Design a protein around this ligand. Structure first.
Ligand code: HEM
Ligand code: HEM
Ligand code: A1A0B
Ligand code: A1A0B
Ligand code: H4B
Ligand code: H4B
Ligand code: ZN
Lengths: 411, 411
C-alpha cells in the first residue's frame, strides 16, 4: 500500500491501484529501466481471463457488478470464445475500454480529460478507402474550427494476425522529410524513411519543408494504399512572436492536430492494431522537441543568430535563451488563432490535480516521471517535485512494430 | 547483457556491469520507483563476505588479483573479524573505496572526475574539536583560491552504533533560515529546523539572509557542539548579470563550495557515518533549484518584475524567461571570479563521454536519469536522449537518518 510524496508541498498520497497492475515493467529488484524508451497470435485459453477481468471492471463501473446482466454477459462472451475463439465488444464496452486505455496511459500528461473522449466505431470498415473516409471525418471532427476535441477511431480488431488493419503513418498529420544531394535534410528528418516509402509506393513529393504527408492505409492485411487528406481539413498555425518581427521571416508553422496512429489499443484481450487518437498540443512538443531536437528541425542555430547572442561560449546559455522565445511564440501564435493549445505550466498543474482525484476515487494513478516532466524548465513545474509510481493497467495503449518490418508483402 | 540506446545519436552500448550489482532498487517486475526520492547494528557473520568482495575487487584493480598479497590480506582481515568482529582498512584501501563510492554514485552528473579525488584520513580523530580542525583544512584545501579541488574527509567508522561520528549539518556551508513574526521566511527555508537546533544549542543568530551556519559536530556518539568556520575560509561569489545592472540591487550571492556532509560512506561492509565530500557547483543547482524552487529562495517573483514581463498570463512563459537570465548570471559571476563552476551543457556532455568510457573499460555505468537530467532545458542537453540503467554497486554513498531523530541524547 505504497506512498508517493510531493517534495514541494509535502503532500502524501497512498497508492493501492498498483495492486490491480498486471503487466511487467522491465524493472527487477536489482535494476530499474525507467529511462528505457521501449522495453518489452493469441489463443482462446488466454482469452477468457482477460475478457472476464475487463467485464468485471466494466459492470463494476456502471454500478451493476455481478447483476444478472453481468453474469449473462460473462456466459455470453465465454460461449462466443468457444464458438469463434474470439469475441466482439458492445458499443458501450468499446467506449469504456478506449476511455480507460487513455486513463491508464502513464506517459500522458493530458489525462485530466480522459472521460471527455469521442469514440468513433469503425469496426464495420473493410477497405483502405473506407479507412480514409473514417480518418477524414475524425480529422474534421477533432479539429472543430480550432476548438479542438479529443477523439479516437477504432478499426477492426486483429483476428488471425495476417489480416491486420494498420495506419502506416506514425501520426495522421506529419511534415515530409527529404534528404539532400549535399547530404543534409529538408523538412522533418524523423520521417525520411516514411517519406521515401510513400514515394516508393507512388507519392509525388513537392520536395519542400512543411509538406503534409499522405496517408498510407492497410486494410484487412492487404498492401497499403496512398490517400491525400483534403488540405482544407489540415489546419495549420503560422508562428509569429509578439515582439520579434524577424520571426515571420523564419517562416515556421505547425499543424494544429496531434494524432497518434501507430499504437495498439488493447481491450479485454482484443487487439485493435489501428486506433488513431487525437488531442491538442502542449506547447513544448512543438517548440522544444519538434523545433529544437538536434535530429528534428534544429532551429536553435538560427533563432540564436537573429537575436545576436554570444554563440562563441557554451556557458552563455544562448541555447536556453533562444528556447524560451520559441515557446512563447508557438504559444502566442496558436492562441491568437483560437486554436487549442496548452502551456507546460498549465498542463502540469492540471495533472497534479488529476493525480489527486485518481488517488482519492481510484486509489492511484500510474505515471511515468521521465515522460510527464516537460522537456524544458522541468523543476519550475510542479510535476518535477512529485513522486510517481509507474505500473501497467489494462485497457492500455501499447507500442507495436512498424508495419513495413512485418508485412508479408505481395504485389 | 542489456543494451542502452541514445535516441539523439543512435549509439548503443552494452551493460554487463549490472551483473555485479548487489543491493535492491525499490522496483519490482510490476512497479517502477525510479521517481521516489528515498526508497529503502551489523554482525560478524555478514561482515566477511562484504570484506572479501571488496578486497577481491581492490586487488583485482592493482593487477594483483589472487597474488600472495591478496591471499594474505584476506586471511588477515578474516582473522581480524574473528578477533574484533570488525576490521580496519589500509590507507590504499580507504582511497580506493572512497573513489569508487563516487564512481558508483548513479545520481551524480560529475563523475568524469571520480579518479581525481583527494582523500583525507581522519580516522585518528577523537573529539568534536578535532573534527572542526579536520573540516577546516578540508574547506581550505578544496577551495584552493577558487580553483576548486575535489576532496573527502573520512572520520572513524561506526562500531557499536551508539558511538557515531556525525556532522549534523546537511552541507558544510549553508545559509541560515529563519521564520518571521508575520509567518514568512528569511534566509533559506530548507534549513529552518536546523537553524533552530543551532539556536537551541546556543547559536546567536545574526538573523539576516545569507548567514553562514555554524558546524554542529558529534564525536564518538557524544552530544554535538557548535563551531564557526573562520569567515576567511568561506568563499562567496556575488551574483551580477552581464547586461542588467539592476541585478546587483537584487543583492544575491552564493558560496563557492558544495560539500555534502549528511551521507554515509560504505566500504567493504564498514560504515563511515561522517564523510563530508566536496566538488564544484553545476550552475543550475544555484540558479534553478536554490534560487527558484518554490520552497527555497523563490526569486522568479522579483527577477520577472525587474524585467517587466507579462506576469498576468501563465502562458507568457515569464517564469521560463526569468529563469534563463538568472542562470546566465550565476555562471557569469562565478567565472569572472576564477571560481570553478560548470554549466549544465558542458557537465552533461562530459557525462555522456564518461558513460562511454565506463561501458568500454568497465562494462557499464549505473545512472539515475531522473537526477542526471538538469532541472532546466532538459531536452537540449544530450543526457535527456540517453537511456540509462540504474543499479546499486558498492562501495557506495547512502542516505542516513538525520541525527536529531536517532541520538539517545543526554545533557
Ligand atoms: C487532451 C489533450 C492531450 C494532451 C495535452 C496530451 C499530452 C500528451 C503529451 C505532451 C504526450 C507526450 C508525447 C511525446 O512526448 O511523445 C502524450 C503522450 C501520450 N498520450 Fe496524451 N495528450 C492528450 C490527449 C490524449 C488522448 C485523447 C489520448 C488517447 C486516447 C492520449 C494518449 C497518449 C498516449 C498513449 C501517450 C504515450 C505515447 C507514447 O508512449 O509514445 N493523449 N500526451
Ligand atoms: C567534481 C565536481 C562535481 C560535480 C559538478 C557534481 C555534480 C553533482 C550534482 C549536480 C548533483 C545533484 C545534486 C542535487 O541535485 O542534489 C550531484 C549529486 C551527488 N554527487 Fe556529485 N558532483 C561533483 C563531485 C562529487 C564528489 C567529489 C562526490 C563524492 C565523493 C560526489 C558524489 C555525489 C553524490 C553521492 C550525489 C548524490 C546526492 C544525493 O543522492 O542526494 N560528487 N553531483
Ligand atoms: C511517439 N510519441 C507519441 C506522440 C507523438 C506526437 F507527435 C504527438 F503529438 C503526441 C501527442 C498525442 C496526443 C494525443 C496529444 C499530444 N499533446 N501529443 C504523441
Ligand atoms: C541532498 N542532495 C545532495 C546535494 C546537495 C547540495 F546542496 C549539493 F550542492 C550537492 C552537490 C555536491 C557535490 C559534491 C557537487 C555538486 N555540484 N553538488 C549535493
Ligand atoms: C532516454 C529517454 O528515455 C528518452 O529521451 C525519453 C525521455 N523522456 C521523454 N519524455 C517525453 N515526453 N517524450 C520523449 O520522447 C521522451 N524521451
Ligand atoms: C519526485 C522527484 O524524484 C524529485 O523531485 C527529484 C527529481 N530529480 C531530481 N534531480 C536532482 N538532480 N535533484 C533533485 O533534488 C531531484 N529531485
Ligand atoms: Zn524502475
Amino acid at each position: 500500500f505504497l506512498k508517493v510524496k510531493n517534495w514541494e508541498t509535502d503532500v502524501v498520497l497512498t497508492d493501492t491501484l498498483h495492486l490491480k497492475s498486471t503487466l511487467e515493467t522491465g524493472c527487477t529488484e536489482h535494476i530499474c529501466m525507467g529511462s528505457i524508451m521501449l522495453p518489452s497470435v493469441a489463443t482462446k485459453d488466454q482469452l477468457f481471463p482477460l475478457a472476464k477481468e475487463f467485464l468485471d471492471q466494466y459492470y463494476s463501473s456502471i454500478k451493476r457488478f455481478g447483476s444478472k446482466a453481468h453474469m449473462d454477459r460473462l456466459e455470453e462472451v465465454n460461449k462466443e470464445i468457444e464458438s469463434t475463439s474470439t469475441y466482439q465488444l458492445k458499443d458501450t464496452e468499446l467506449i469504456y475500454g478506449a476511455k480507460h486505455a487513455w486513463r491508464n496511459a502513464s506517459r500522458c500528461v493530458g489525462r485530466i480529460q480522459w472521460s471527455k473522449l469521442q469514440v468513433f466505431d469503425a469496426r464495420d470498415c473493410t477497405t483502405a478507402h473506407g479507412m480514409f473516409n473514417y480518418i477524414c471525418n475524425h480529422v474534421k471532427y477533432a479539429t472543430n474550427k480550432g476548438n479542438l476535441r479529443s477523439a479516437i477511431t477504432i478499426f477492426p480488431q486483429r483476428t488471425d494476425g495476417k489480416h491486420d488493419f494498420r495506419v502506416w503513418n506514425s501520426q495522421l498529420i506529419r511534415y515530409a522529410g527529404y534528404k539532400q544531394p549535399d547530404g543534409s535534410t529538408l523538412g522533418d528528418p524523423a520521417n525520411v524513411q516514411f517519406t521515401e516509402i510513400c514515394i516508393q509506393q507512388g507519392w509525388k513529393a513537392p520536395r519542400g519543408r512543411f509538406d503534409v504527408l499522405p496517408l498510407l492505409l492497410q486494410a484487412n492485411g492487404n498492401d497499403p494504399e496512398l490517400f491525400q487528406i483534403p488540405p482544407e481539413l489540415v489546419l495549420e498555425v503560422p508562428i509569429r512572436h509578439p515582439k520579434f518581427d524577424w520571426f515571420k521571416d523564419l517562416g515556421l508553422k505547425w499543424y494544429g492536430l496531434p494524432a497518434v496512429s501507430n499504437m495498439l489499443l488493447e481491450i479485454g484481450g482484443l487487439e485493435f492494431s489501428a486506433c488513431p487518437f487525437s488531442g491538442w498540443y502542449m506547447g513544448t512538443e512543438i517548440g522544444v522537441r519538434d523545433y529544437c531536437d538536434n535530429s528534428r528541425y534544429n532551429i536553435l542555430e538560427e533563432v540564436a543568430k537573429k537575436m545576436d547572442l554570444d554563440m562563441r561560449k557554451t556557458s552563455s546559455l544562448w541555447k536556453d535563451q533562444a528556447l524560451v522565445e520559441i515557446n512563447i511564440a508557438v504559444l502566442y501564435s496558436f492562441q491568437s488563432d483560437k486554436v487549442t493549445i496548452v502551456d507546460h505550466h498549465s498542463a502540469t498543474e492540471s495533472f497534479i490535480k488529476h493525480m489527486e482525484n485518481e488517488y482519492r476515487c481510484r486509489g492511484g494513478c500510474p505515471a511515468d516521471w521521465v515522460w510527464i516532466v516537460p522537456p524544458m524548465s522541468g523543476s519550475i513545474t510542479p510535476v518535477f517535485h512529485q513522486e510517481m509510481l509507474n505500473y501497467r493497467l489494462t485497457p492500455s495503449f501499447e507500442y507495436q512494430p512498424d508495419p513495413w518490418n512485418t508485412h508479408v508483402w505481395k504485389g
